[PDB]
Amino acid sequence: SRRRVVITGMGMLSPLGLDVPSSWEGILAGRSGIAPIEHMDLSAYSTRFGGSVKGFNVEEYLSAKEARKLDLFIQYGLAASFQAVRDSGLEVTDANRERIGVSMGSGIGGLTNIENNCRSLFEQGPRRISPFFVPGSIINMVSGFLSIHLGLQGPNYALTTAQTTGTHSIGMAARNIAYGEADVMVAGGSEMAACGLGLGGFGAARALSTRNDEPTRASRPWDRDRDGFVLSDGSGALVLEELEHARARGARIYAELVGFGMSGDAFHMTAPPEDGAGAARCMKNALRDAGLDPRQVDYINAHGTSTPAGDIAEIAAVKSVFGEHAHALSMSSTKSMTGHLLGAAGAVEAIFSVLALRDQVAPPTINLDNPDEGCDLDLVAHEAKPRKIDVALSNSFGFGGTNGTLVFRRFA
Amino acid sequence: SRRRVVITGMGMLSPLGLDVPSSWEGILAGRSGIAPIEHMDLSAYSTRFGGSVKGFNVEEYLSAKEARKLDLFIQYGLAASFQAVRDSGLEVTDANRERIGVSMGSGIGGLTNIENNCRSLFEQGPRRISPFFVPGSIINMVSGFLSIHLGLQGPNYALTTAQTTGTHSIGMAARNIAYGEADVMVAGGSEMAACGLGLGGFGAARALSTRNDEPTRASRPWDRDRDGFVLSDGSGALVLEELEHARARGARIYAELVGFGMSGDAFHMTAPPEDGAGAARCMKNALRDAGLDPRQVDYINAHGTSTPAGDIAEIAAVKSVFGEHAHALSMSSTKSMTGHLLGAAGAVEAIFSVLALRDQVAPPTINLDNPDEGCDLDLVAHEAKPRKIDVALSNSFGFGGTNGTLVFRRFA
Ligand SMILES: CCN(CC)C(=O)c1cc(C)no1
């Protein structure tokens, strides 16, 4: 047997906001966080826009001196984590610190630091590389810094599964608690891949929208005029907690995490199979894990990246899994508003799935002006839809064909 | 309920060889894999040597057209993975492909490729960034490419926990099998951080030995004249398999994985605590997980990096965990010969621990000419020691205070 895992705290930086409630207000209003990227000469680039975090003040979290040691993606991960831990009300003590761990990940890690240190290396030579280049750039330093700052001695690790990172981080942290290796985990992901290297690297694969004239209309999941994903920055963290532990201290419980699925497509380095067979296996594994029938799902937060092949693969996968229930659930892509936060996508979208449960509302897929061929599900086009939601899924389908699904259920 | 996990296949690239038997021959003969680096000009660097993989032929594994797309860390991880799967005798079929996954990790991943593309970006422009920049560099793509080549549809992920990566990858993969999420996992790690940012960045932290004039003597764990770690490249992969699945197909079983521990130090971003308190918590977790009396431990493959603080912290931790039995077990650092493969260290060292069990021999700590203050355990100085080994423990410690321990034992 297995213990129950609940969500007691959430934290976020996104293109919509510097916290969860500001971000969520944007989501339910259909607001875009996408804009031309500033303080960068993007003249030579085919994409000049994305989802930046606006007005982030790291000195609310760290001293200037500690922040100078860390890449932006680590700053963002620590901000969401500190928010989530504050939101949980949890008191770390000598009696529980060995039972509290961290799994905060990233898909691409420290590109901004790699750029700035490459500048020094190329121009001046290796003796100008920062002493903090390695520890301030490696993906496990959100978990590392958070554990040092809060005195967490539980399991300490970091996943990196490209665009699936946040989903896998949360699911695997839930397993840690369910199987008794921890009582509390801080889990999620963070990403800062604006930089030239993110825009240039994805741009070279022609993976990005190039709708430079109308950045807010670029991310248009399942719309016939979509032309690839929009790159976005930020972070999501959840406090996952064993249910009896949460009840004993009088925690506020947002929702229960009942299911976690994983699969591999074993198909292609970057593209999904046309029928989303892997995504279907992963959703079926998550529902089996939750002991739920597909007919019990009310709301899906899609991966919904605005890539032609990805978006159609998900429709096929959902039709395959859900059969005569596929039209009754509501499925939306919040990436229509946030863009694609890569390894943090699954983290912020797990939060939006939990808030869909709290508020009984399916967030919109904005920009869905002309659904493409076969995109005839309830994709919540344009405007948020109040509805009954007992069970919400969140999907992430990333490079290497790596798939993750989380199942959340209302708690009372 | 929790299933038993055995080792049925192993694969490796190291500074001592292009497979496991050749590497292990070097280990038992006390041979150094460390030499001046030939693949780039290091005259401006304070460290000009390391553990390179010599004579690697990627066309033993993959077409030249595919290999040109992939950072060396991916090529090394695939080579070790392919060797491990072949060594296992396992046949992937429609009946089992959903139950076989992969967890191959890296500390830094494709830094060579990111550096080369950053040079293109800065000197020329984004138009010269490779289309394969992202899928040829990011850490999850060992697991990704391996799954595509062999048709593995089970859990597909990657850890990145700095120098603890290979140990965490193997332990977490064992938990997948133990808890019924998979029947077979390919798990381990790969690293190739020997580029200007890697050598420069560890150099700027003054973390590396600067013994340029005698590279084979540079790595000297617990020696009073040690002056930092030696940077090394390669990969380890193991096929982990549920016991009854291995028995059912008549697999050759090398050893059983009986224990896994993690802990965070919660001490410092890069320094280990002097008393080894986090390492001790991690080993005690692993020994309890294995249902063992600490006196059952015969052999410890130490982290043993040849840093002043790391090496003495490990003595303190072993004395704290094992008490008077600390004087009866044998503990060695194979990094004395291989150097520090960073995210691959725990993977190659897990393999060396399993071969210590197969061959009933403790590998030597070479270069241990003058053991430092308090370094008065059996550290198998200079020469391999034939001895009874029923239980072997492999330790890793990393940036962020992240600790892993694996416990292996002979299978009958
Ligand atoms: C054109 C050469 N090939 C196919 C063998 C490749 O580059 C290749 C194989 C996989 C997997 N991804 O890409």
Short mmCIF file of N, CA, C and O in Angstrom, two decimals, chain A residues 85-143:
data_model
loop_
_atom_site.label_atom_id
_atom_site.label_comp_id
_atom_site.label_asym_id
_atom_site.label_seq_id
_atom_site.Cartn_x
_atom_site.Cartn_y
_atom_site.Cartn_z
N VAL A 85 6.84 27.34 -0.07
CA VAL A 85 7.08 26.95 1.34
C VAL A 85 6.37 27.94 2.26
O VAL A 85 5.62 27.47 3.15
N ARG A 86 6.48 29.26 2.01
CA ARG A 86 5.72 30.28 2.78
C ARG A 86 4.21 29.97 2.68
O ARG A 86 3.52 29.97 3.71
N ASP A 87 3.70 29.71 1.49
CA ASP A 87 2.25 29.49 1.25
C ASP A 87 1.76 28.26 2.03
O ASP A 87 0.55 28.19 2.40
N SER A 88 2.64 27.29 2.24
CA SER A 88 2.28 26.01 2.92
C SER A 88 2.12 26.24 4.43
O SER A 88 1.44 25.41 5.05
N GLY A 89 2.79 27.25 5.02
CA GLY A 89 2.83 27.46 6.48
C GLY A 89 3.74 26.44 7.19
O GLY A 89 3.78 26.41 8.42
N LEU A 90 4.47 25.59 6.46
CA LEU A 90 5.24 24.49 7.10
C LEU A 90 6.37 25.04 7.97
O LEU A 90 7.07 25.98 7.59
N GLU A 91 6.52 24.48 9.15
CA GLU A 91 7.60 24.82 10.09
C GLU A 91 8.61 23.68 10.04
O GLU A 91 8.29 22.55 10.46
N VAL A 92 9.79 23.96 9.51
CA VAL A 92 10.92 22.99 9.48
C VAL A 92 11.54 22.99 10.88
O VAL A 92 11.81 24.07 11.42
N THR A 93 11.78 21.80 11.43
CA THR A 93 12.34 21.60 12.78
C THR A 93 13.40 20.51 12.76
O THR A 93 13.53 19.79 11.75
N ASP A 94 14.14 20.40 13.85
CA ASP A 94 15.08 19.27 13.98
C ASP A 94 14.30 17.96 13.92
O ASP A 94 14.85 16.99 13.48
N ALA A 95 13.04 17.94 14.31
CA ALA A 95 12.22 16.71 14.37
C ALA A 95 11.77 16.33 12.95
O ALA A 95 11.36 15.20 12.81
N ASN A 96 11.78 17.23 11.94
CA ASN A 96 11.20 16.83 10.63
C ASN A 96 12.15 17.12 9.48
O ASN A 96 11.80 16.73 8.36
N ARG A 97 13.30 17.73 9.72
CA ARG A 97 14.10 18.24 8.58
C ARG A 97 14.61 17.05 7.72
O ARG A 97 14.79 17.26 6.52
N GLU A 98 14.80 15.85 8.27
CA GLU A 98 15.29 14.70 7.48
C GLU A 98 14.15 14.15 6.60
O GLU A 98 14.41 13.30 5.75
N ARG A 99 12.93 14.62 6.79
CA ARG A 99 11.71 14.12 6.11
C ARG A 99 11.23 15.13 5.07
O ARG A 99 10.16 14.91 4.45
N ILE A 100 12.01 16.18 4.82
CA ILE A 100 11.63 17.29 3.90
C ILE A 100 12.72 17.38 2.84
O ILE A 100 13.85 17.64 3.18
N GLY A 101 12.34 17.14 1.60
CA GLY A 101 13.28 17.18 0.47
C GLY A 101 12.84 18.12 -0.60
O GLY A 101 11.85 18.83 -0.45
N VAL A 102 13.61 18.12 -1.69
CA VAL A 102 13.48 19.07 -2.83
C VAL A 102 13.75 18.31 -4.13
O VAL A 102 14.72 17.52 -4.17
N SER A 103 12.93 18.56 -5.15
CA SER A 103 13.20 18.13 -6.53
C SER A 103 12.67 19.26 -7.43
O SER A 103 11.50 19.27 -7.85
N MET A 104 13.53 20.22 -7.67
CA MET A 104 13.30 21.32 -8.62
C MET A 104 14.25 21.11 -9.81
O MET A 104 15.47 20.81 -9.60
N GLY A 105 13.68 21.14 -11.00
CA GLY A 105 14.44 20.82 -12.21
C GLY A 105 14.49 21.98 -13.19
O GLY A 105 13.86 23.03 -12.98
N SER A 106 15.10 21.69 -14.31
CA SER A 106 15.17 22.61 -15.47
C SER A 106 15.43 21.76 -16.72
O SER A 106 16.13 20.75 -16.62
N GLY A 107 14.91 22.21 -17.85
CA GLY A 107 15.05 21.56 -19.16
C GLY A 107 16.38 21.91 -19.79
O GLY A 107 17.03 20.98 -20.33
N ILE A 108 16.80 23.17 -19.69
CA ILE A 108 18.00 23.63 -20.44
C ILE A 108 19.05 24.25 -19.53
O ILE A 108 20.16 24.40 -20.00
N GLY A 109 18.70 24.69 -18.32
CA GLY A 109 19.68 25.13 -17.32
C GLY A 109 20.26 26.49 -17.67
O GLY A 109 19.52 27.34 -18.12
N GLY A 110 21.56 26.68 -17.42
CA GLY A 110 22.13 28.03 -17.25
C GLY A 110 22.64 28.68 -18.53
O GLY A 110 23.80 29.08 -18.55
N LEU A 111 21.80 28.87 -19.55
CA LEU A 111 22.23 29.42 -20.87
C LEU A 111 22.73 30.85 -20.74
O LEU A 111 23.66 31.18 -21.48
N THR A 112 22.12 31.68 -19.90
CA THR A 112 22.51 33.10 -19.72
C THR A 112 23.92 33.18 -19.13
O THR A 112 24.73 33.98 -19.60
N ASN A 113 24.19 32.39 -18.08
CA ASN A 113 25.53 32.26 -17.46
C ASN A 113 26.53 31.70 -18.48
O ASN A 113 27.63 32.24 -18.57
N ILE A 114 26.16 30.65 -19.22
CA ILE A 114 27.06 30.06 -20.25
C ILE A 114 27.41 31.14 -21.28
O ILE A 114 28.61 31.34 -21.51
N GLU A 115 26.44 31.94 -21.72
CA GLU A 115 26.68 33.04 -22.68
C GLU A 115 27.68 34.02 -22.10
O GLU A 115 28.60 34.38 -22.83
N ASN A 116 27.43 34.50 -20.88
CA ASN A 116 28.23 35.58 -20.28
C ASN A 116 29.63 35.04 -20.04
O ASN A 116 30.56 35.81 -20.27
N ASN A 117 29.77 33.77 -19.63
CA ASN A 117 31.13 33.23 -19.36
C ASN A 117 31.86 32.91 -20.65
O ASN A 117 33.10 32.98 -20.64
N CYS A 118 31.14 32.55 -21.72
CA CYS A 118 31.71 32.37 -23.08
C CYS A 118 32.28 33.69 -23.56
O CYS A 118 33.42 33.67 -24.12
N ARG A 119 31.53 34.77 -23.34
CA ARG A 119 31.98 36.14 -23.68
C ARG A 119 33.37 36.35 -23.07
O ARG A 119 34.31 36.60 -23.83
N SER A 120 33.51 36.17 -21.75
CA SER A 120 34.81 36.30 -21.03
C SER A 120 35.86 35.36 -21.64
O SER A 120 37.01 35.81 -21.91
N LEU A 121 35.54 34.08 -21.77
CA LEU A 121 36.50 33.07 -22.31
C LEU A 121 37.04 33.51 -23.68
O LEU A 121 38.27 33.39 -23.93
N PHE A 122 36.14 33.88 -24.59
CA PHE A 122 36.49 34.09 -26.02
C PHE A 122 37.32 35.35 -26.15
O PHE A 122 38.28 35.35 -26.90
N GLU A 123 36.92 36.38 -25.39
CA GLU A 123 37.45 37.75 -25.52
C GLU A 123 38.79 37.83 -24.79
O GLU A 123 39.76 38.30 -25.41
N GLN A 124 38.82 37.37 -23.54
CA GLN A 124 39.89 37.66 -22.54
C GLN A 124 40.67 36.39 -22.16
O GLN A 124 41.85 36.55 -21.77
N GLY A 125 40.09 35.19 -22.32
CA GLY A 125 40.74 33.92 -21.92
C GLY A 125 40.12 33.25 -20.69
O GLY A 125 39.34 33.86 -19.96
N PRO A 126 40.48 32.00 -20.37
CA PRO A 126 39.81 31.27 -19.29
C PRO A 126 39.97 31.86 -17.88
O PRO A 126 39.12 31.59 -17.03
N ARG A 127 40.99 32.69 -17.63
CA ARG A 127 41.24 33.18 -16.25
C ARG A 127 40.17 34.22 -15.92
O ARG A 127 40.07 34.59 -14.75
N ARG A 128 39.36 34.66 -16.88
CA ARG A 128 38.23 35.60 -16.60
C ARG A 128 36.90 34.85 -16.40
O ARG A 128 35.90 35.53 -16.17
N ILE A 129 36.88 33.52 -16.44
CA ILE A 129 35.64 32.75 -16.12
C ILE A 129 35.33 32.93 -14.62
O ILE A 129 36.24 32.93 -13.80
N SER A 130 34.07 33.15 -14.26
CA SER A 130 33.64 33.33 -12.85
C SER A 130 33.95 32.08 -12.04
O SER A 130 33.73 30.96 -12.50
N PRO A 131 34.51 32.23 -10.82
CA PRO A 131 34.68 31.13 -9.87
C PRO A 131 33.38 30.38 -9.57
O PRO A 131 33.41 29.23 -9.17
N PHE A 132 32.25 31.06 -9.74
CA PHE A 132 30.93 30.49 -9.40
C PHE A 132 30.27 29.97 -10.67
O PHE A 132 29.14 29.52 -10.57
N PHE A 133 30.98 29.96 -11.80
CA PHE A 133 30.40 29.52 -13.08
C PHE A 133 29.76 28.14 -12.92
O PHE A 133 28.58 28.02 -13.27
N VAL A 134 30.50 27.15 -12.41
CA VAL A 134 29.93 25.77 -12.32
C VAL A 134 28.80 25.72 -11.29
O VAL A 134 27.68 25.37 -11.64
N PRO A 135 29.02 26.02 -9.99
CA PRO A 135 27.95 25.81 -9.01
C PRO A 135 26.76 26.75 -9.24
O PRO A 135 25.64 26.36 -8.91
N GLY A 136 27.01 27.90 -9.88
CA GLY A 136 25.95 28.89 -10.16
C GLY A 136 25.22 28.62 -11.46
O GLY A 136 24.35 29.45 -11.82
N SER A 137 25.55 27.53 -12.19
CA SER A 137 24.91 27.23 -13.49
C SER A 137 24.26 25.85 -13.53
O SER A 137 23.47 25.62 -14.44
N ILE A 138 24.64 24.95 -12.65
CA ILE A 138 24.19 23.52 -12.74
C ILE A 138 22.76 23.40 -12.22
O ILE A 138 22.35 24.12 -11.30
N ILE A 139 22.03 22.47 -12.80
CA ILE A 139 20.56 22.45 -12.66
C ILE A 139 20.17 22.07 -11.22
O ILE A 139 19.08 22.52 -10.78
N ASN A 140 21.01 21.33 -10.50
CA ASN A 140 20.60 20.84 -9.15
C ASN A 140 20.80 21.94 -8.11
O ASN A 140 20.55 21.67 -6.94
N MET A 141 21.17 23.17 -8.49
CA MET A 141 21.47 24.19 -7.47
C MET A 141 20.20 24.85 -6.94
O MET A 141 20.29 25.48 -5.88
N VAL A 142 19.05 24.74 -7.60
CA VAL A 142 17.79 25.19 -6.93
C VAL A 142 17.53 24.29 -5.72
O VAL A 142 17.33 24.82 -4.62
N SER A 143 17.52 22.98 -5.92
CA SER A 143 17.39 22.00 -4.81
C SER A 143 18.52 22.24 -3.80
O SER A 143 18.25 22.26 -2.60
#
